[PDB]
Amino acid sequence: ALLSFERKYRVPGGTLVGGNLFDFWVGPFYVGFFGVATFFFAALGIILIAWSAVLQGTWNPQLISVYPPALEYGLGGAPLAKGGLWQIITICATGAFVSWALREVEICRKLGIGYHIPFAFAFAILAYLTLVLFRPVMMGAWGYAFPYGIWTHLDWVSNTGYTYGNFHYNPAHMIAISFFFTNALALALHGALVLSAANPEKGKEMRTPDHENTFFRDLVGYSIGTLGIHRLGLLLSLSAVFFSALCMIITGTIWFDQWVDWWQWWVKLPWWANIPGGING
Amino acid sequence: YQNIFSQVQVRGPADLGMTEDVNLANRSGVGPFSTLLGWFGNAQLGPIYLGSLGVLSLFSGLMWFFTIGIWFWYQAGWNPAVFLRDLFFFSLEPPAPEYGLSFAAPLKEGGLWLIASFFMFVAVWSWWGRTYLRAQALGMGKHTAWAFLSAIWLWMVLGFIRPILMGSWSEAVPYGIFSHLDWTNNFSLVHGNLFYNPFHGLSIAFLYGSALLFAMHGATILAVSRFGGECELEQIADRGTAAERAALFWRWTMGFNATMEGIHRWAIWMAVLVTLTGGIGILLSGTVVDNWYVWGQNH
Amino acid sequence: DLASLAIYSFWIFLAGLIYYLQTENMREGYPLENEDGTPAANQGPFPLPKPKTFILPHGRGTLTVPGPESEDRPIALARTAVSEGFPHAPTGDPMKDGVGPASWVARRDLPELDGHGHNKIKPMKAAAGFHVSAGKNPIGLPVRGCDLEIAGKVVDIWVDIPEQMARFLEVELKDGSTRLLPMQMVKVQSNRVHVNALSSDLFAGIPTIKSPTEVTLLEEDKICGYVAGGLMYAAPKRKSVVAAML
Numbered sequence: 092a093l094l095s096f097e098r099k100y101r102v103p104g105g106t107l108v109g110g111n112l113f114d115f116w117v118g119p120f121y122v123g124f125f126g127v128a129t130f131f132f133a134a135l136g137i138i139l140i141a142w143s144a145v146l147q148g149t150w151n152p153q154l155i156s157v158y159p160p161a162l163e164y165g166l167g168g169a170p171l172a173k174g175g176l177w178q179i180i181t182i183c184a185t186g187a188f189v190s191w192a193l194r195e196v197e198i199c200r201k202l203g204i205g206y207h208i209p210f211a212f213a214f215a216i217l218a219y220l221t222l223v224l225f226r227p228v229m230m231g232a233w234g235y236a237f238p239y240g241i242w243t244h245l246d247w248v249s250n251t252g253y254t255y256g257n258f259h260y261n262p263a264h265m266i267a268i269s270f271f272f273t274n275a276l277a278l279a280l281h282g283a284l285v286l287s288a289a290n291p292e293k294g295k296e297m298r299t300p301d302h303e304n305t306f307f308r309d310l311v312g313y314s315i316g317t318l319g320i321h322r323l324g325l326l327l328s329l330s331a332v333f334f335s336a337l338c339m340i341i342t343g344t345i346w347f348d349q350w351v352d353w354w355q356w357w358v359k360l361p362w363w364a365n366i367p368g369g370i371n372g
Numbered sequence: 373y374q375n376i377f378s379q380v381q382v383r384g385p386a387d388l389g390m391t392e393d394v395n396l397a398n399r400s401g402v403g404p405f406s407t408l409l410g411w412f413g414n415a416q417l418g419p420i421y422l423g424s425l426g427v428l429s430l431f432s433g434l435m436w437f438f439t440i441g442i443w444f445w446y447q448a449g450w451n452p453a454v455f456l457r458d459l460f461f462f463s464l465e466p467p468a469p470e471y472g473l474s475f476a477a478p479l480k481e482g483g484l485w486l487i488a489s490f491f492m493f494v495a496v497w498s499w500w501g502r503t504y505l506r507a508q509a510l511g512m513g514k515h516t517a518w519a520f521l522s523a524i525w526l527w528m529v530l531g532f533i534r535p536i537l538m539g540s541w542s543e544a545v546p547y548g549i550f551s552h553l554d555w556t557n558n559f560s561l562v563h564g565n566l567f568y569n570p571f572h573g574l575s576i577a578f579l580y581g582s583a584l585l586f587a588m589h590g591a592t593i594l595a596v597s598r599f600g601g602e603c604e605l606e607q608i609a610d611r612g613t614a615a616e617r618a619a620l621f622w623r624w625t626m627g628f629n630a631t632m633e634g635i636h637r638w639a640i641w642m643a644v645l646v647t648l649t650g651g652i653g654i655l656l657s658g659t660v661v662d663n664w665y666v667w668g669q670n671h
Numbered sequence: 672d673l674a675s676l677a678i679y680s681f682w683i684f685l686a687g688l689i690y691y692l693q694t695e696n697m698r699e700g701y702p703l704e705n706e707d708g709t710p711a712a713n714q715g716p717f718p719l720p721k722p723k724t725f726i727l728p729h730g731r732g733t734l735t736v737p738g739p740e741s742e743d744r745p746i747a748l749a750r751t752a753v754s755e756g757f758p759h760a761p762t763g764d765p766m767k768d769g770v771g772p773a774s775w776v777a778r779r780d781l782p783e784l785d786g787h788g789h790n791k792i793k794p795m796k797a798a799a800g801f802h803v804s805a806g807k808n809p810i811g812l813p814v815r816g817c818d819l820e821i822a823g824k825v826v827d828i829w830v831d832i833p834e835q836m837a838r839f840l841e842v843e844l845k846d847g848s849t850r851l852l853p854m855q856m857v858k859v860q861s862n863r864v865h866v867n868a869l870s871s872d873l874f875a876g877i878p879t880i881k882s883p884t885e886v887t888l889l890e891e892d893k894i895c896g897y898v899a900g901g902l903m904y905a906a907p908k909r910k911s912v913v914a915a916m917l
């Protein structure tokens with residue numbers, strides 16, 4: 092089934108691999124070579140997870156957990172039930188995520204639009220890979236990666252965090268958090284502004300962009316503008332994930348102690364380091 | 373060209389905006405133009421509207437800030453070098469538990485915190501009234517005021533509603549960079565790990581989800597700016613190929629899509645649910661549930 | 672347990688919100704159709720929302736959604752297979768017929784007005800006070816197509832007044848006439864403006880505007896649709912990145 096204005100868009104072309112072989116749809120979904128590659132990776136990966144559940148002895152979604160290889164194994168392979176299944180599943184996940192992005196690219200081409208979406212999605216893939224591939228490699232072992240379990244991965248966040256005390260003190264973590272908050276703040280503001288203009292007080296004509304500019308200008312003395320707000324939203328959310336990947340990639344590789352101690356460099360600056368008083372004197 | 377930054381900036385005379393039912397007397401004059409901002413968005417700063425409510429809000433807001441600062445200078449012994457080196461370590465703490473919900477705590481042991489909080493209370497609420505009235509004067513919907521309420525709800529729960537239900541100001545958050553971080557960690561430790569708090573998990577879902585959706589929406593709009601997609605209100609009133617292509621990218625990708633107007637409803641709720649569920653998770657902590665792990669065990 | 676009742680309730684609420692949100696996003700494009708244009712059997716589990724009416728500014732009418740699909744112009748495409756789910760090939764020239772990446776919508780054939788009732792978009796020559804404030808001014812630069820041939824020159828910038836932003840570049844062709852090029856489809860460089868979506872020979876084909884001082888929504892769409900369609904349909908004439916660096 093198609094949207095009442097869709098047919099004119101379902102034309103051939105745009106694929107990156109396989110010419111017209113996979114150039115078709117299944118219901119609303121577009122396929123393409125990467126559409127099948129995704130199905131392949133997702134199917135196999137889900138199958139290997141189910142098998143890991145079998146070996147684990149549970150079908151409970153709240154209990155199923157696939158762990159990476161113990162520190163012993165370092166960066167080598169490992170028996171299926173002891174880290175190997177996690178290694179293959181990770182590959183299937185990476186392959187499925189990358190295929191989903193490449194599939195989004197064929198979709199962009201068929202529709203003649205920009206490539207911003209798959210580009211932005213790549214930041215997410217890069218954050219995932221940072222935890223499962225990049226940091227584990229710099230640290231020398233797949234064991235440092237997180238487990239695939241609903242609650243177990245939270246345990247991993249907790250333990251990893253306290254391994255350095257209160258993780259809040261990670262300076263890169265602070266910046267990331269700021270972007271996440273600022274982002275949700277901007278998202279709420281954007282939706283409300285547009286909506287407030289499209290749905291003015293009952294009985295009134297739709298408001299216009301000028302009204303949007305006037306509302307915010309009257310409110311905070313500034314209006315970023317329609318193009319700018321979409322540029323900001325993408326900026327904030329991409330910067331948050333980037334500083335996330337950054338705050339972890341440096342943890343355990345170039346910084347090993349309690350993060351709170353890192354701040355001492357500023358406190359120990361020679362010109363005020365020994366002045367009695369305050370909190371640190 | 374990815375349209376992240378403008379290739380060329382264009383500028384016309386200062387824009388004074390719409391009048392509608394706004395009292396122009398309370399509107400200042402245009403500010404300076406920033407070429408810097410102009411690369412990313414609008415270069416125009418101002419004008420701003422400042423009626424009585426606005427003056428009230430700004431005054432209280434400053435008194436809040438200044439109160440915290442004067443105490444910081446005190447904690448620094450009035451020494452400039454100490455103020456800057458320990459700036460993140462200073463903290464204005466609320467009254468000790470011994471004082472319950474009373475306003476009898478000595479200035480240096482809670483009173484200053486309460487005074488600062490009173491100013492913050494007034495600042496935020498009068499600013500909320502302001503988000504409602506500025507929209508009313510322009511005949512717009514009150515969506516901004518409602519969304520803002522959701523954030524106010526988490527704020528209120530943290531320093532007013534929960535402390536009161538708990539019986540003492542000592543439960544509130546201290547005014548300090550690091551101290552409010554220690555408070556946050558301690559809060560989780562004291563309530564048996566907040567990861568087991570269902571509402572904390574949802575709140576995270578919406579926080580991650582807000583970055584998910586804004587990255588999605590921002591990238592989408594930019595991807596179709598080649599057809600004037602940013603003119604969203606214009607696309608709502610008279611759908612164009614920008615709105616159609618945007619919708620089809622997502623329909624073909626994940627099997628379903630939105631509309632130019634509907635996507636902003638998805639967005640305001642995605643964001644608003646962050647603090648909405650968050651406020652609920654914190655309010656229940658220590659009043660109904662002492663330990664989330666334990667509570668999780670019976671659910 | 673109060674917390675248990677709260678979480679229980681939230682999920683009910685959430686399921687209801689999603690339901691509400693999904694239906695609101697069905698004010699355009701529905702009912703769904705089979706490829707032949709007839710109502711598809713499966714419309715999904717969400718019913719169409721109750722209609723709402725938008726009162727357009729400056730009395731330009733009303734908009735009630737959902738309502739009968741507004742697209743009724745001829746679509747130059749033909750089925751490529753008997754089964755559903757397959758491409759539809761252009762019967763003629765997709766660029767001229769306006770299909771595929773070159774599709775456009777029949778928007779109101781009137782220029783968009785700002786909140787003060789004036790045309791939202793104006794040539795800079797006619798926008799009192801507007802000037803280039805930063806960056807390389809493209810006016811005067813020769814415009815190059817993907818075939819690496821000059822297709823014309825920049826004679827002005829069309830500005831969005833309220834947003835104070837450049838929306839289009841007005842380009843004069845060899846014959847002396849001009850076309851509007853979408854700003855986010857051009858690359859301004861030191862010695863010229865480069866257009867990747869079109870080869871010089873395709874500029875003349877860019878839809879034209881009736882009045883040389885304004886542009887309507889319908890024209891915008893035809894111009895924007897045509898220029899983008901070039902990315903796919905002009906690819907045969909698009910020189911490689913190598914010949915370009917030459």
Ligand code: BCL
Binds near residue numbers: 248257338
């Ligand atoms: C006690 C625990 C510690 C702590 C320990 C840690 C640790 C340890 C980590 C963080 C990380 C983060 N912390 Mg912390 N953190 C603490 C307290 C906080 C507080 C707070 C208010 O107190 C905040 C706001 C944060 C915030 C954050 C975020 C900035 C960051 C996670 C986002 C991210 O990286 O996404 C990245 C985005 C992704 C990973 C998404 C990948 C998605 C993939 C590509 C697609 C999935 C497709 C899917 C499978 C298909 C589903 C099926 C379909 C739906 C059908 N922390 C406390 C002090 N924190 C993490 C970080 O920086 O990570 C890099 C991290 O590792």
Ligand code: BCL
Binds near residue numbers: 140574577578
């Ligand atoms: C750096 C950040 C940490 C981390 C820290 C946390 C914390 C802290 C929390 C979660 C929570 C969640 N995490 Mg996590 N999480 C990490 C990496 C991941 C990855 C991944 C491939 O990288 C995935 C798929 C998830 C998925 C999830 C969701 C199950 C859950 C809430 C949804 C949400 O916020 O959606 C944002 C995205 C959307 C709203 C889009 C829809 C996505 C759907 C919901 C995801 C389906 C996940 C699915 C169950 C996995 C099975 C896939 C099948 C096998 C194919 N996390 C990394 C390691 N995560 C929350 C929770 O309640 O956990 C129990 C929570 O509190």
Ligand code: BCL
Binds near residue numbers: 571
């Ligand atoms: C060790 C610490 C604990 C923990 C303890 C807490 C506590 C305690 C809380 C959270 C809360 C949150 N946690 Mg946690 N959290 C942990 C780990 C995590 C992780 C992770 C490991 O990945 C993540 C992703 C999160 C994520 C989150 C967010 C979903 C949520 C905060 C939303 C927010 O900032 O609103 C920010 C919005 C506001 C604070 C609104 C109020 C703003 C007011 C209205 C504006 C004042 C402006 C003022 C006047 C100053 C003006 C500034 C000038 C203009 C510049 N937590 C660990 C396990 N977390 C909060 C929540 O809701 O929990 C349920 C919370 O209270």
Ligand SMILES: CC[C@H]1c2cc3[nH]c4c(c3C)C(=O)[C@H](C(=O)OC)c4c3nc(cc4[nH]c(cc(n2)[C@@H]1C)c(C(C)=O)c4C)[C@@H](C)[C@@H]3CCC(=O)OC/C=C(/C)CCC[C@@H](C)CCC[C@@H](C)CCCC(C)C
Binds near residue numbers: 195240328329584
């Ligand atoms: C700037 C980064 C932000 C971002 C952006 C972003 N995400 C995106 C996009 C963009 C721009 C898309 O275009 C794409 C999308 O299509 O959205 C609807 C997507 C998307 N983001 C998703 C999830 C997601 N994004 C997240 C975060 C973020 N996305 C960031 C905040 C998170 C978290 C944890 O915060 C999650 C859970 C998907 C819904 C969707 C991409 C869908 C996809 O890749 O499907 C491929 C196929 C499958 C069904 C995968 C099967 C995988 C199996 C082989 C293995 C098992 C996975 C295992 C590793 C998980 C372990 C689970 C435990 C941790 C619980």
Ligand SMILES: COC(C)(C)C/C=C/C(C)=C/C=C/C(C)=C/C=C/C(C)=C\C=C\C=C(C)\C=C\C=C(/C)CC/C=C(\C)CCC=C(C)C
Binds near residue numbers: 441493529548
């Ligand atoms: C003056 O000095 C010079 C340099 C000019 C300036 C220096 C100022 C400085 C350095 C200021 C620094 C300020 C900082 C670091 C502030 C940090 C705040 C942080 C980190 C977090 C805030 C959390 C606060 C919350 C959750 C507050 C909630 C408050 C309320 C809900 C209102 C509570 C109101 C009460 C108790 C009053 C009760 C009375 C009545 C009747 C309403």
Ligand SMILES: CCCCCCCCCCCC[N+](C)(C)[O-]
Binds near residue numbers: 378411806
């Ligand atoms: C509120 C966000 C402020 C963003 C300011 C961004 C400044 C970046 C400017 C880059 C412009 C580069 N250049 C030469 C191409 O014009």
Ligand SMILES: CCCCCCCCCCCC[N+](C)(C)[O-]
Binds near residue numbers: 514515518522640644
């Ligand atoms: C306590 C906070 C609860 C606030 C919930 C606000 C949600 C914002 C909803 C925006 C839509 C508003 N409405 C009624 C005009 O349609």
Ligand SMILES: CCCCCCCCCCCC[N+](C)(C)[O-]
Binds near residue numbers: 573578642
């Ligand atoms: C607008 C989209 C709303 C749905 C967001 C998806 C949330 C999934 C949350 C999983 C959290 C589960 N829980 C109970 C364990 O916290």
Ligand SMILES: CCCCCCCCCCCC[N+](C)(C)[O-]
Binds near residue numbers: 628629689693714716
């Ligand atoms: C995180 C929750 C977001 C997902 C909300 C689910 C929306 C499903 C909409 C089904 C629409 C199906 N279709 C093709 C018939 O339109």
Ligand SMILES: [Fe+2]
Binds near residue numbers: 589593636
């Ligand atoms: Fe938008």
